[PDB]
Amino acid sequence: PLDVALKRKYYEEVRPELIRRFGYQNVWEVPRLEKVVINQGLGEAKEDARILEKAAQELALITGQKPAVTRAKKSISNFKLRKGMPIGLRVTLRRDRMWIFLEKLLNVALPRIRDFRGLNPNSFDGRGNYNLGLREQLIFPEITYDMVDALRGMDIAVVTTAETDEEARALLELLGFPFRK
């Protein structure tokens, strides 16, 4: 798996349209994708014996990459746990794996989102790079209906070489990012 639609149809379409739209000097001066990083978080290192790398492999299906556990630092005595030993759950996607995920996300996921209308327009709001989150885990294709103990969500963050959030606002809408402007 070495070249997908978003891959190809970035260099052979979206690439030139931005050197036009903005008039750059360098192949490096144009915006690219750096990285996509998803985070689950939850907070379920509690009682009743809490396993939940059970739900970290169902995350590894949709992405293909195996996620690392992320731990705690302070202590919310207000709503339980402290110290360390916790739940937060994370994975960093770079290239190929990157596009493959984004591919199915744009073709099959956001479509599957119960009502939907388009992504929120200004979750860049300035600082280059973009962020979105989700309620459901089953709007994903490779994850089934009958293998759910309990639906849950995630926080998808997408990074970019572009300085301003104009340069970025373009690059993503061109690869097919549905916007509720």
């Binding site: 293909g64 493959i100 744009l106 479509p111």
Partner: peptide
């Protein structure tokens, strides 16, 4: 591995994932 997604709206998308057999009710075509 490489894979095919099979919509309830006829269409067939060809990407990769794991497990190649995928019945989906609707992609980006409605």
């Amino acid at each position: 591995v490489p894979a095919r997604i099979i919509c309830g709206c006829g269409n067939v998308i060809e990407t990769y994932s794991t497990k190649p057999e995928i019945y989906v009710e609707v992609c980006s075509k409605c």
